[PDB]
Write a protein that binds this ligand. Structure first.
Ligand code: GD
Ligand code: GD
Length: 595
């Protein structure tokens, strides 16, 4: 796809070179334009490669004298839009506006160019492969280029500010996505001055078709300067007492009013790295901290203590599993057998068995509750693990009633997934809070690396030992008696957790002594470079990423409790405007001191 526009751009410059009209429009040769138009007559409605006219070419390369000649000899080329799919809708006005050619925009509105002609070309879309996104209307182009003179000059000739594009975005939404944040704020105020002036149907209330007001889009897109500037409209200073200044906050589009209309939900669910800084701002950081200090932090410990007791319940049901002897003379064929199955399905022989039967019941009603609260549908694995645990618990009771050999298989999987999920609640303890995010964000880029390497090193050295020790007998050292144990023993050797094969009575093969020296070296070099490369995330900027991501998790988890829990507890944050001078809106009282 990228080569197409590269081809069509090289194709355009070829057609400009071929057509002497389009060449004179690109080179601003007024001497040749009159020779081509008045003397030896040519097609003045000539269409270029990109569906352009000679006027569109004269507007690209800022050439005013050529454009005026093209309009004095054919004033209908102004209404002419670009016809190609890449520029479907662009007019000669859009090119002059985005080039900030005020004299050409002035002359184009004299001819009466449509200030409402959309530009639906593919290069005008809000896509990553396009370097910019200025919208579709000429009013939106002047707002993005930072030319306040063209903006009002377009409104003078009937430009509509309510004009939404394909994505249902007004000119306000488009400025929020722009890079030059420090200059677009004055442009944002200039556009609002032309509003209707009534409290209803304001331009700041017109939502993006993704359900986003311009204020809401600022926080989602991580636009701090626009969020701060948009916040001036929604805060009421109460009084000024020396350095102290008690101010009131609107809390309308913030907090959690509507289901998905809440902004806090949008900030924690977005993948935008910049959005995590919005909840650190002075309307939100007061809110989220009050929602946590009370009603947030305590309820997280209640659910945690309940889950800790629920798992220690199921743990006891496993350590006190059913009992039964071997009941088979099987421990002689393949005399390495070791099993003593404790699996009989008894019926209510309970001097102390019903104590775990209710524990088996508690483990089931808790697992079906866990399944019926998380499957009806950052903290990711610590909620995918719980549904897999409750899946293993339900398979554990399915492992019963069939009495299969692998009774312990789904039960041992549930015993580890259920416990290691307790450090999910570690994200709300100050100390190991950021620790849990450190071990979590390390499973991706710093765990799969050096394991694909370690796995390839084992695949090499482990299999060699099998060949070396498939000749000798396993009665002696035996670390590699079959190919699976040839791999598993060397894996343990890679982490030095095994003492290394060493027998000093017999004579070891001539290749083991050489290969293990090379193993002890490479298994430690790849163990040290795993330590150093992993470290490389200890910058002073990471000191925030260690903390403000944990706070983002605490803020995200604080929103998790407020949605599902009932309304008898956790009252709405702030104080309602009703029964006060305000009106049925909830406000936060925050005061500060300027030094
Ligand atoms: Gd032996
Ligand atoms: Gd040892």
């Amino acid at each position: 796809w990228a080569q197409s526009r590269d081809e069509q751009n090289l194709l355009q410059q070829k057609r400009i070179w071929e057509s002497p009209l389009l060449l004179a429009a690109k080179e601003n040769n007024v001497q040749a334009l009159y020779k081509l138009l008045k003397f030896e007559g040519c097609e003045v409605h000539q269409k270029g490669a990109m569906g352009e006219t000679a006027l569109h070419i004269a507007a690209l390369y800022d050439n005013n004298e050529a454009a005026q000649v093209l309009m004095e000899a054919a004033p209908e080329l102004v209404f002419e839009p670009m016809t190609s799919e890449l520029y479907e809708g662009q007019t000669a006005l859009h090119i002059a506006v985005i080039n900030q050619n005020v004299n050409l925009v002035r002359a184009l509105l004299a001819r009466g160019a449509s200030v409402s002609a959309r530009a639906t070309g593919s290069v005008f879309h809000y896509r990553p492969h396009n370097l910019i996104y200025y919208g579709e209307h000429p009013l939106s182009f002047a707002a993005c280029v930072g030319s306040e003179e063209i903006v009002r000059l377009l409104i003078e000739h009937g430009a509509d500010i309510r004009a939404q594009d394909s994505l249902g975005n007004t000119v306000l939404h488009i400025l929020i996505l722009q890079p030059n944040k420090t200059f677009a704020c004055q442009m944002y105020n200039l556009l609002l001055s032309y509003d209707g002036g009534d409290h209803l149907k304001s331009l700041e209330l017109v939502p993006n078709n993704q359900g986003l007001t311009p204020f809401k889009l600022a926080g989602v897109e991580g636009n701090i300067v626009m969020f701060q500037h948009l916040m001036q409209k929604r805060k009421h200073i109460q009084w000024t007492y020396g350095p102290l200044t008690s101010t009131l906050y609107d809390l309308t589009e913030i907090d959690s009013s509507g289901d998905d209309q809440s902004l806090l939900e949008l900030i924690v669910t977005t993948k935008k790295r910049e959005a995590r800084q919005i909840l650190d701002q002075t309307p939100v950081k007061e809110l989220v901290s009050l929602k946590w200090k009370r009603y947030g932090r305590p309820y997280f410990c209640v659910l945690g203590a309940i889950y800790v007791l629920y798992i220690i319940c199921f743990t006891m049901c496993c350590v006190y599993r059913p009992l039964k002897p071997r009941i088979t003379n099987r421990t002689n064929p393949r005399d390495n057998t070791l099993l003593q199955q404790k699996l009989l399905q008894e019926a209510y022989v309970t001097p102390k068995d019903d104590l775990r039967l209710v524990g088996e019941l508690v483990s089931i009603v808790g697992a079906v509750i866990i399944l019926l609260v998380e499957i009806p549908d950052l903290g990711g694995p610590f909620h995918v693990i719980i549904v897999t645990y409750a899946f293993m618990v339900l398979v554990t009771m399915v492992m019963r009633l069939t009495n299969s050999d692998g009774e312990v298989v789904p039960m041992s999987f549930a015993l580890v997934l259920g416990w290691c999920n307790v450090m999910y609640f570690a994200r709300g303890f100050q100390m190991l809070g950021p620790f849990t995010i450190m071990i979590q964000k390390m499973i991706f880029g710093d765990l799969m690396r050096f394991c694909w390497l370690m796995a390839v090193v084992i695949l090499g050295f482990a299999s060699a030992f099998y060949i070396i020790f498939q000749t000798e007998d396993p009665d002696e050292l035996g670390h590699f008696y079959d190919y699976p144990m040839a791999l598993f023993s060397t894996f343990e050797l890679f982490l030095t957790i095994i003492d290394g094969p060493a027998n000093y009575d017999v004579d070891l093969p001539f290749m083991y002594s050489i290969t293990y020296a090379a193993f002890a070296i490479i298994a430690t070099l790849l163990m040290l470079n795993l330590l150093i490369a992993m470290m490389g995330d200890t910058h002073w900027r990471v000191a925030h990423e260690r903390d403000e991501l944990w706070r983002a998790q605490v803020v995200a988890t604080t929103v998790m409790l407020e949605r599902k829990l009932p309304r008898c507890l956790w009252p709405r944050s702030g104080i309602c405007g009703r029964e006060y001078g305000l009106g049925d809106r909830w406000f936060l009282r925050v005061e500060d001191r300027q030094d």
